[PDB]
Design a protein around this nucleic acid. Sequence first.
DNA 1: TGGGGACTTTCC
DNA 2: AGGAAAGTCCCC
Lengths: 312, 273
Amino acid sequence: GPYLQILEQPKQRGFRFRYVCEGPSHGGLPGASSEKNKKSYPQVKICNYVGPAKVIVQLVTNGKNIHLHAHSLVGKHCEDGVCTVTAGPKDMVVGFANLGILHVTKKKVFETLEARMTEACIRGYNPGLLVHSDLAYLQAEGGGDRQLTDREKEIIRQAAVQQTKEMDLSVVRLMFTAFLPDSTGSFTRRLEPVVSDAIYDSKAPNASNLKIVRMDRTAGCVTGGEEIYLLCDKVQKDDIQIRFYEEEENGGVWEGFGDFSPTDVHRQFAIVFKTPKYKDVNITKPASVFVQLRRKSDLETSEPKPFLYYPE
Amino acid sequence: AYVEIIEQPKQRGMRFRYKCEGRSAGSIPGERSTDTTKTHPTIKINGYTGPGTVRISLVTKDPPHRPHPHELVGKDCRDGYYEADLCPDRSIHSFQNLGIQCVKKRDLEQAISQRIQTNNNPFHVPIEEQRGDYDLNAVRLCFQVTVRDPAGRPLLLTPVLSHPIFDNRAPNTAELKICRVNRNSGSCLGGDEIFLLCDKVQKEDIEVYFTGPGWEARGSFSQADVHRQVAIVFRTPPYADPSLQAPVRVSMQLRRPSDRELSEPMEFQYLPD
DNA sequence: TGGGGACTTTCC
DNA sequence: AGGAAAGTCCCC
């Protein structure tokens, strides 16, 4: 039957969440597209369609299960960290251009959280499935400002607490939901929700785009243990590693790992390391590998810089 | 009866702390100090010995010495000023409990309000002057002592100021400090690339000052070359002598144009061409 | 409709 | 005590 499909996921790596104190129109969640002379932006499309229909977008978690994230989506048609774009004609594809991630202050997570779960247990379209599934029920019908059960608000509220401790504010995920015409009028029915790849805040030190800005010597002897000054970009002293490497014919790669210590990682943007022994110290002709910064934790690497293992 | 500072507070190097950091965690040390034989600011009341009060307070680093918005904190500190009874059987007394608590720029009015609510101003500067924006990056201690007059009533000695003290956090008011360093030999001709691993500097106002008394030269580089306030990549300066024969070994040190501070130098080995 | 560097405060 | 993170400012 009908069903939302993701025509284009969000860029995922490279979009800096912006604090409510930075300014509107600071950037826009890009779609997964660099493609030279051409912008991009996330977009979804129904299937076995519904002519006219409305789709709302909101931010969920990234862990094992999909929960309601404090940061809110902010852009044109957005309001209350939700965005009601309507895909209601003869054309189902519906993009979400110029969207943004308000970065919530640690200081204010519980508050926005409780204030989100709550403005959702009263929806059903936002089933207790996301707050306290103890809340299991609801559908869509309505209930604007409708009171919630006193004991209810609690299971909501306390959920708006044991989850805040677990909420990672450095990563989010889009949660596109489609609603369609029902019982004459109302885009009453929740047509299965789709959730996007993880979007990693660009400012989290843990999410930085390892880049090799400069380097002392490009070449070096194979005999190893040679000091080099490699000026990078926001690395994390413990969680970083310089890595030399070269592929030997079909498949099979070769790797070397610059020597050093957190000590040698000077002010997060400098690492002073000594070269390693190349493949084999016995080489009558200059050898060329590549060096690449590397985050130990996720193994996210970087556009590499070439090296030149000259003979002994 | 006159006050005199026989040991100033260690000017550059201490980083004023906001009240929000675990409270305390140190004290102002004196110009001369080191972990083996530590020190703290001291004054020698001259021409009197005995009972009185030894009041201190922070003041503007320049001309109108207005009560500055930061606050001193420690033992016997209140409303921003250290105020206590000084030990009568000595004329030279130090304060090893002087903290400099800084205010977030936003509560900056509430403080200067307090610096006259609390009734605080050694130099009695007019409200008009107190309005001008502050330099929350540098303070002067203002020792103003009270001894006793020939009769026995309290006597207000002249307020004396100590060399300014500069924050360390403020990236522009810090102490230039080179760290590691790619190389240093170069040659008389100069044009060589060195990598410098400076301490947090500023690409607009800073610049390697190759020098050696009988000479002096900056390193050729550019703001673009200053990597995250931390790394500078310049090129070894042409030496004054561009036809050397033997090894003149000058000295290079990061210099900060604006204030002119320079750092402890290193040994660049300008070689024979 | 953009984005990035570094300044200020806070955490540890 | 430093060093970093968290959060704000601000400019090309």
